[PDB]
Subunit: 55 residues, 2 copies
């Protein structure tokens, strides 16, 4: 679990690749690749959330 | 990977337990338990984000 992710985590930092790319790069299920995105605040929170246009 | 999560995912829905509880319940590493939280929008986005107090 942590072994493949350690090498995969570095790849994420280098390009912030999507979980689909990391999954194929290490042939790991989306759960492992998706979790790396969950730890990456930049790829996880993509704006949206709120910040409406104010009333 | 998906087998334990399937049973663990149901437990998450029942109580929205934190990844620490699910990890101990199925004795799985934080990566597997943390990913379930990543899929749960209610436990993932806990307000914050933005929504400042306006100027
Ligand atoms: Zn990223
Ligand atoms: Zn939840």
């Amino acid at each position: 679990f942590l072994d493949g992710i350690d090498k995969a985590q570095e790849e994420h930092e280098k390009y912030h690749s999507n979980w689909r790319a990391m999954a194929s790069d290490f042939n790991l299920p989306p759960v492992v690749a998706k979790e790396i995105v969950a730890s990456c605040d930049k790829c996880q929170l993509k704006g949206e959330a709120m910040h409406g246009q104010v009333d």
